[PDB]
Symmetry: D2
Subunit: 473 residues, 4 copies
């Protein structure tokens, strides 16, 4: 049975047993005991005590811990890949080739970034007084990881927090805790006792006790708009600082000018990768009238060829949805779309028969801007196509969204590419590609998609405190 | 009869009439009509529409507007000084010499800062893809100004917001709206219609309608922990980004090693400036045992010599408190302190007889760490002194606070000065001085004092959105 | 008689009288007395003494001087425009509309930039030691301005130097000293005595005494490769730090994909602006085979329509060359090109008959990569066109150059635009435009075009000294 | 016999055989064949060809090479330590504990720094044009390493150059080539053929051919003012960009206020570390009158106790000088000092009898500001003490120096510490310590000590080219 990491020691949860499912088979993998309210407190106390020493360590010392942690993960790559695949339904080959190396890279990046923090020039801004600017750690940080990319999001939250010199108490999703608890075993001795704490449990029993704790200085979350609203109004009286990543409905803007085959191949991969359970998924397509019909046919052929199957089988391209509950939300969202007279189901449409939580790759055409399928996030293997005419029009539509995380523009015109990317209200804009992320570049939303960034130097800065020290001569 | 600025036009408030008092005489200066819920909506709509054009302006164009605005204020310095003094009770000479030039400087600083935003090096972080980082405006910004420094805090909120390319809807405190409404008349033509909107009203009628509006992307506030908690839980479902400045209880740590006369003179000025109605006020003193008694006597002499009087009279050093309601809170806080048997009233103690809301400069000695007078913010002309022994001890006490805005250390030891300033959990730490602020350096709290900064390049960055654009070759 | 500015006082040069010509009429405007070797020494001594006080001023204080200087220039815009036009032959309307506002903007930009210098985060990089980074002024700076943009280059050298907190001794070109000496009269009282020193004379008598002086810490130059080599080997034993701007042969790469009319209009303006006497002039064109012939015809029509005439006449588009000596160099360079059998003269060709130093706008086609007309800088109203086939080919040719200042690529392909701009070895690369400069962005060469940059924060950083201060706890 | 690294292959030098000495025994260790002029050309050609591919690699790819190189050095720590100690005379324990880990850290630091380069925010600085800033590699870099810290300076030159994406051709000092040639064997396969080239030979035969080569874009040097003047005037016609590190005479300013025992211990270590053969050596002491006599006695006791002996013996604190030629320069410099009637020899004085190039740790007191022993660098185990009275006085003396690399101030006054460190004209100023360097912080001189920095992000920036790309919409 997997254990919890509290103050450098592995312990069994004193809370209620919770069952962890295998989304590909619908069967229960294991049963893990949650953290009790007293253990959540114990974890925060451990972090609070550890901070006095850990917050004074040099960036060099911290970089060395992160590099050591990265090595541990890389050496255990295969094991993490099997767990992540078994617990999430992600095709095994994708985890081994894409995710694990990305995770390893994230730690290495932050190890380096920890020693490169920006400041302002120290000097005499006021006659006879030397001012300087330092970036100190915040203190105790509570991290809540989502279920779509369990280990990767854990990395996105641990790396910058630890690099900045904070103590962390992280809770993975109750749906997907395996990789996080495995990491806890390896990282146990890498950091001083209390610096890293890994808990387990539901957002109602463990999550709320953790985020509401008086000694937690910052709460970084990744989830849906629903679970994000809950935490932001729960931590409001304490005036805690937050870091929000709350999904998105990434628009894919295609002009007549675009390479249709490249768009089709891109949407085939990026709109259905990880069963479309991704905040940056290419799920909302705006196709210009001229190429609309041609693109719809190409997408139809590309999407319908996606092979669904066993995650451990090399040929499998599409896995199942994370849980029974999520399968129901996706089904409902697709049914509302089919109910609309003008919506054409090009391929897929409903959930497939079998043990797992599989849902057929769906392509919905002739969708209109006002439709729910275009406005609300589905977070499943569903893609919609909407026709448009001019730039001004598509730009207004893209920007008239509650979301603002990622987007892509497909066009060959240099002028148009830069003109739109400058005006889109999305934290990220790809041109003639989509879904590509790198450790050096920031990833974060705008509007209801949240605030604060993952990865890059900006990601590290969110876990620091700018401080002004002024000495009088 | 002052008007509101909505979409480049001056209009009369359709809401209820509200009376504005002169704290020095206790008399009503004027009666101003509040903004109606429809006008608050009209103001936000005006800003939202203006953003399409304003967000695309060059930093150069924006810098020119700010420089032009700064000139307007400087040319009307004397008029603003009289209004600010009449409405706040601030000694006139202090407003003319300290505040107005500071306000003018803030605009000039941001005018320059607008053209110096940081980014990451553009390049190929991923083979065959050029990534670049841009800092774009957030959109519509709602600013709520406090009553202690009406025009200055207005500047602290308008300058960075406008420099970053946002559209602002600002509401000054109902207690002190004169300077803001005066600024509205001058800035009317400097910015395009809708870019700058100035409203008026109570936090319950106007403030809540403004901060809760769906089109407001960001809310920047400066006030108490009470009004801050209210707004943060009100905007929580919309997942809006905030900028909080929520007061503080600035500690003044004095070692045996310190220059006692310099401390006394400093506390005389900085602990009672603006009637102690300042977040950075030197109000909580920790004096080391060796020099404790000597410092208490020096402070007694320094504080009791503060001349209270008419704001327009050149000799006046201390003005009244902002309002009748605040006079009552300060009186209550001081009475609770006097009730404690161990507290010694060195000077002052209670409110002075007369028309205005004057309160005598109070010095409370022998206060203990656990006392309410040391833990809770008084935000009045009240200073407490607590004895201490070692650094470790005073450091724990200073850090065991809900507040984290400013602090000062008075000592001659180079080692000690740097050792403590590195470990204090305050956004700002002065050494052998206190209260000194400069436009280039950041000012912002930690913990319950808030997050986000006023002034400096960091102040401007809080009003921008980091965006990652990636072009595939 | 124009005077020199030494130690806050205006004085007559003790050196030999030098005549200043009007390039449009070939007549002498005035006669100015050069600075004597003793006065050059006096100027450097004045700067050296003034540095003790000036180097300690706050960035705010310096920003205020620059803003005040900018106002003075803007208020005297028309007068400077007439002098610059009379002394350089530049069409008056271009000076009033383009140059003066640019100059004013440069000062304003640096006034703001002075308060935004970058540093690294202060902190404990070594246990028990606080490290911080400050940017201090270099000391006494000697600036040598060129003759093509007398007042603008003066601004490019004075603004960052003064903003950084240095004391400057500037010498404009003996050919064009009017605007600089006029500026000296206005700036006289803006800066403390000795902070700004304006001298006059030939590079042999005044320039060498100034650049070789023991108290000059840095020398910033803008001129030809010849005058640059002379100064770099003259200051070599003193190990002085330099800032070089040594011309360039900006390539204009045009693909089949490009908008030919936009290229023609661009080359018409940017290849002949200021009589082609500009380091960034679009003088070397590489046209892809597909559009070669069509572009040559369009350029022929565009270039031949350029109206040459009196600088004060509104319709004049092309002025004369700076001096008789330069007219001879340009004539010689063009004659060597005509001598080559394969070179086709599309338009212009030789110097025009008349009093001024006018040279007809020349377009030379069928030029080959190895030709002298393509390799060496002409710095006149001459443009060459070379045919090319692939990207790899044109990229090798563009990079196989001693120069590396500016360049432009004309194409509609997003991929190509970014792929080439990433690989070009030029300090600047424009896409579908050319010659556009802004105060916020850096301008500086690579290879023999020099090192160090003009404008932007990078321009200011070149006049500062990064210093590491480390305090042991 | 050690080989050269040219285009990924190890080859024997075709030049004349040169003997490498063991400074501790005065005996010849080995005889190595120099690189022939044709091989130096072959090395540069190899680098030039390799640049096309290497300059396009991602910062991630480069970081991975540096991390891999760092591992190789760390795994071979002991071997490098023995070679460095045998070839330089450095006590073995110092190399194992101080140098090797520092070298390893430098590579790791730059591996991280390579992915964190600064730029300016991309955006529209000019209406309808997107500007962005990229930092591209310079091209082929020629590095000349000094003899004092052979492997460390090699690291200081290779790490940033390679991290920035340049191709390097490095030549260690002919006196100390062992560690560099050993590194060549290990790094052979880590980088693509031609990216890293290691040559060997005298500055006259190999050095001049390398630095004068037409394809070398940048030359980074570390040596004396003599060898620096030679290279700067040799590369002057090519207008190559340089990076100079030319020694220094680090002042140690001690006030009455200082901890004399801490100063004595500091000077004992830092003034004689590596036999005083260091640019940052605490060799020039200014002691305030009050503590002058007391400090001279303490230094006398501290210096005379330094144990000289075999480098491989654990107890050895002081090693010999690098070569017979340098032993002669040091002896001459000390003899000129002894000749002065006012100079008191407290300890040491002359060279010790024995096989090696040992020189006794010398302390010269009562030295005056004008004396040659205080003005010129000795670069040996020699320390001078000068008395002073006021700050203004000592500040003028410290700044009236041709050197400007490092310095230290010993005082307990916070005001004084910051007031002096702000005004010292040295690239580095330590307070109550000396000689401490960290990878994150810059190390570089001012005035005749050179320009450009080693270590930190600034160190990496010197090997990049800021480029402005502007796309028109």
């Amino acid at each position: 049975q997997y254990q919890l990491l509290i103050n450098g020691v592995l312990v069994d949860g004193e809370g209620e047993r919770q069952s962890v499912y295998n989304p590909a088979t619908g069967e229960v993998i294991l049963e893990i005991a949650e953290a009790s309210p007293a253990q959540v407190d114990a974890a925060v106390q451990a972090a609070d005590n550890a901070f006095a020493e850990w917050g004074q360590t040099t960036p060099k010392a911290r970089a060395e811990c992160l590099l050591k942690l990265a090595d541990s993960i890389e050496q255990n790559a295969l094991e993490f890949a099997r767990l992540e695949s078994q617990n999430c339904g992600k095709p095994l080959h994708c985890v081994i080739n894409d995710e694990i190396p990305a995770i390893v890279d994230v730690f290495r990046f932050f190890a380096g970034a920890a020693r490169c923090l920006s400041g302002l020039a120290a000097g005499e801004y006021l006659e006879g007084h030397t001012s300087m600017i330092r970036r100190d750690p915040i203190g105790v940080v509570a991290s809540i990881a989502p279920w779509n990319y369990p280990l990767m999001m854990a990395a996105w939250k641990l790396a910058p927090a630890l690099a900045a010199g904070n103590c962390v108490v992280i809770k993975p999703s109750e749906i997907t805790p395996l990789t996080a608890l495995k990491l806890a075993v390896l990282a146990k001795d890498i950091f001083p006792p209390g610096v890293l704490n890994v808990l387990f449990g539901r957002g109602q029993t463990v999550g709320d006790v953790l985020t509401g704790h008086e000694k937690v200085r910052m709460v970084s979350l990744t989830g849906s708009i629903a679970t994000g609203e809950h935490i932001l109004r729960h931590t409001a009286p304490a005036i805690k600082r937050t870091h929000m990543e709350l999904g998105g409905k990434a628009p894919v803007i295609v002009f007549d000018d675009a390479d249709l085959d490249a768009v089709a191949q891109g949407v085939r991969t990026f709109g259905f990768y990880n069963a479309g359970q991704d905040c940056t998924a290419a799920c909302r397509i705006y196709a210009q009238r001229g190429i609309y019909d041609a693109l719809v046919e190409k997408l139809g052929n590309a999407v319908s060829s996606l092979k669904m199957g066993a995650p451990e089988d090399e040929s499998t391209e599409l896995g199942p949805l994370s849980s029974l509950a999520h399968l129901k939300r996706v089904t409902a969202a697709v049914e509302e779309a089919k109910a609309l007279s003008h919506i054409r189901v090009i391929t897929g449409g409903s959930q497939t028969e079998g043990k797992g939580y599989y849902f057929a790759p769906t392509l919905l055409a002739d969708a209109k801007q006002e439709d729910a399928i275009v406005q609300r996030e589905v977070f499943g293997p569903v893609v919609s196509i909407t026709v448009f005419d001019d730039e001004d029009q598509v730009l207004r539509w893209a920007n008239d969204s509650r979301y603002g995380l990622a987007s892509s523009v497909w066009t060959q015109d240099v002028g148009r590419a830069h003109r739109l990317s400058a005006r889109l209200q999305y934290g990220c804009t790809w041109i003639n590609t989509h879904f590509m992320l790198v450790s050096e570049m920031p990833h974060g939303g705008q509007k209801q998609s949240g605030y604060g960034k993952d990865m890059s130097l900006y990601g590290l800065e969110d876990y620091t405190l700018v401080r002004h020290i002024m000495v009088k001569h």
